[PDB]
Amino acid sequence: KTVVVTTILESPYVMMKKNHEMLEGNERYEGYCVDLAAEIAKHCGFKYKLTIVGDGKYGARDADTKIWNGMVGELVYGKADIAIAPLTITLVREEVIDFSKPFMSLGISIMIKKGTPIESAEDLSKQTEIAYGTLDSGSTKEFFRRSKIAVFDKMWTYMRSAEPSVFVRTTAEGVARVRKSKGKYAYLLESTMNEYIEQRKPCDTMKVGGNLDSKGYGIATPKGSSLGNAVNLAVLKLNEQGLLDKLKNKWWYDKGEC
Amino acid sequence: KTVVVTTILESPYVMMKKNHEMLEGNERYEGYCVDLAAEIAKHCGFKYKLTIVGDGKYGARDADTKIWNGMVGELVYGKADIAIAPLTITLVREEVIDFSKPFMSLGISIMIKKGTPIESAEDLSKQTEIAYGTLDSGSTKEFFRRSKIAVFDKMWTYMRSAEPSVFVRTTAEGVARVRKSKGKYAYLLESTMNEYIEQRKPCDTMKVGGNLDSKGYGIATPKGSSLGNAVNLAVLKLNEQGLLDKLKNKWWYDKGEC
Numbered sequence: 001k002t003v004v005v006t007t008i009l010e011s012p013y014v015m016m017k018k019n020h021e022m023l024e025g026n027e028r029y030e031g032y033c034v035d036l037a038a039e040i041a042k043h044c045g046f047k048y049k050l051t052i053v054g055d056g057k058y059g060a061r062d063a064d065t066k067i068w069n070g071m072v073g074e075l076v077y078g079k080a081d082i083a084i085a086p087l088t089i090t091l092v093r094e095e096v097i098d099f100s101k102p103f104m105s106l107g108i109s110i111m112i113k114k115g116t117p118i119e120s121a122e123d124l125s126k127q128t129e130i131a132y133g134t135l136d137s138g139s140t141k142e143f144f145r146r147s148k149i150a151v152f153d154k155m156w157t158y159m160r161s162a163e164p165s166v167f168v169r170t171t172a173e174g175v176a177r178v179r180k181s182k183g184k185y186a187y188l189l190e191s192t193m194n195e196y197i198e199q200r201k202p203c204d205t206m207k208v209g210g211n212l213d214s215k216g217y218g219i220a221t222p223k224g225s226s227l228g229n230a231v232n233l234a235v236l237k238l239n240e241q242g243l244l245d246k247l248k249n250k251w252w253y254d255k256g257e258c
Numbered sequence: 259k260t261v262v263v264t265t266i267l268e269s270p271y272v273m274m275k276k277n278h279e280m281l282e283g284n285e286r287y288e289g290y291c292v293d294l295a296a297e298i299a300k301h302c303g304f305k306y307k308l309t310i311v312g313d314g315k316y317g318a319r320d321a322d323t324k325i326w327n328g329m330v331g332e333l334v335y336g337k338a339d340i341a342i343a344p345l346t347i348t349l350v351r352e353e354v355i356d357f358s359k360p361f362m363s364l365g366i367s368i369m370i371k372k373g374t375p376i377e378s379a380e381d382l383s384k385q386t387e388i389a390y391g392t393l394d395s396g397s398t399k400e401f402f403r404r405s406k407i408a409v410f411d412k413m414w415t416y417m418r419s420a421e422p423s424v425f426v427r428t429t430a431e432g433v434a435r436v437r438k439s440k441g442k443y444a445y446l447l448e449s450t451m452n453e454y455i456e457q458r459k460p461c462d463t464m465k466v467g468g469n470l471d472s473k474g475y476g477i478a479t480p481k482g483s484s485l486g487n488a489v490n491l492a493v494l495k496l497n498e499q500g501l502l503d504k505l506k507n508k509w510w511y512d513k514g515e516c
């Protein structure tokens with residue numbers, strides 16, 4: 001009956017409201033994806049319940065055990081009906097779940113503390129003084145792992161063997177590491193997040209260079225779900241009607257602190 | 259069964275080679291989409307034949323007869339098996355054909371002569387000295403017709419009724435009009451095309467402002483087609499390897515002349 005929506009606490013997509021302890025259900029949350037879920041639900045005419053993914057992950061398959069974790073796993077094992085989050089559309093995931101056309105276009109980017117003498121991935125790969133890493137679990141880390149491109153593979157060899165770990169548990173942890181490193185740590189992350197952080201106090205970070213790749217976030221459903229076709233059409237209509245642009249402005253720039 | 263691929267002569271996607279005279283079949287052509295087609299066909303193990311769409315159109319449904327024209331129509335009526343071209347993923351099209359995930363992300367942009375006192379969509383809609391239009395039977399013309407945004411509607415109420423017609427049956431005709439207008443005509447077109455033209459001699463055009471929207475091009479197949487799922491995974495695979503980026507640079511800037 002009620003559509004179970006799995007999502008992840010990742011600002012500004014989904015965040016706990018200030019007085020969330022005084023609220024119940026969907027009203028406890030706010031964000032880009034909270035607004036998008038309400039809109040998809042209104043347009044497709046269904047009732048839903050937002051639930052935060054238990055393990056706080058996006059979705060990877062463990063080799064050997066072959067088990068899918070994160071939001072992807074919730075869909076694959078039937079714990080949720082749909083995933084509305086900054087979940088990257090990838091080949092390995094499309095083999096086990098369905099994705100709508102992209103509701104957001106992005107690429108891997110470089111975040112630096114202002115003043116850091118780095119302007120590109122080639123720059124990072126060629127030097128050793130400034131450390132760099134990615135979100136430990138996700139498509140960004142997998143991009144570097146699977147890349148046959150020289151600069152990116154060179155970057156991976158270093159990241160995989162770096163001690164202590166250059167990988168981080170959450171975006172917030174990567175941003176704090178960039179902010180506290182005196183420019184000795186650069187962070188590789190999804191471009192839209194890099195832009196978001198660039199508009200947050202203390203306004204000491206910035207995106208440098210072009211994006212390393214091009215991809216998109218999609219709404220996900222279990223293969224052969226009855227919700228799949230409907231939701232894909234909703235994303236296309238919402239995009240055409242300009243809602244996706246408006247939501248980005250609201251959560252990124254209208255709220256900008258710099 | 260040899261796959262009939264429908265496409266469109268639009269540079270640098272599909273162009274007849276300089277020496278097409280002594281060549282035959284798929285050999286007469288070169289381009290971004292020619293390379294892409296060979297890639298998909300290689301990775302999915304099928305034989306194909308490139309055919310240029312009969313009416314030279316992208317695809318739109320006649321409001322009276324309800325009949326689909328262009329590349330979309332060839333797929334809908336079963337005249338072709340797959341469409342590999344700069345075809346925009348839209349809602350109305352997704353209702354009658356299948357689209358893979360985008361092989362290229364883009365948006366509507368402004369092309370000016372050079373020296374033209376226009377720096378944005380607002381600028382265009384505030385004046386009448388400079389004429390402006392779009393292509394036809396395309397997603398660009400439709401974007402302005404359906405736009406509820408104050409500025410874009412202001413532009414359409416002018417374009418729609420603008421005599422002499424500011425619309426062009428072909429991209430080449432739009433670019434030619436900008437070039438021979440003495441700066442009195444600005445053209446609204448898709449960003450990747452605008453960027454390509456800016457790198458072509460006489461090097462007298464320029465893209466100004468940011469994109470008015472965000473969309474993507476996808477490889478299209480008729481609904482129910484078994485080639486659809488395969489080709490989608492093929493697009494994701496190719497993009498992930500960095501091939502689409504490789505093909506973008508090759509045809510856009512390695513071959514640039516400015």
Ligand SMILES: N[C@@H](Cn1cc(I)c(=O)[nH]c1=O)C(=O)O
Nearest residue numbers: 058087088138139140189190193
């Ligand atoms: N979108 C990713 C998760 N994810 C998120 C952020 I924000 C980032 O910087 N890198 C990632 O891999 C996925 O889907 O795994």
Ligand SMILES: N[C@@H](Cn1cc(I)c(=O)[nH]c1=O)C(=O)O
Nearest residue numbers: 316345346396397398447448451
């Ligand atoms: N991609 C469009 C066609 N198309 C093409 C170009 I190049 C442009 O500038 N505008 C369009 O509508 C479609 O698929 O209709």
Ligand SMILES: [Zn+2]
Nearest residue numbers: 039042043243
């Ligand atoms: Zn709505």
Ligand SMILES: [Zn+2]
Nearest residue numbers: 297300301501
């Ligand atoms: Zn290949």
Ligand SMILES: [Zn+2]
Nearest residue numbers: 320321322323
């Ligand atoms: Zn008619």
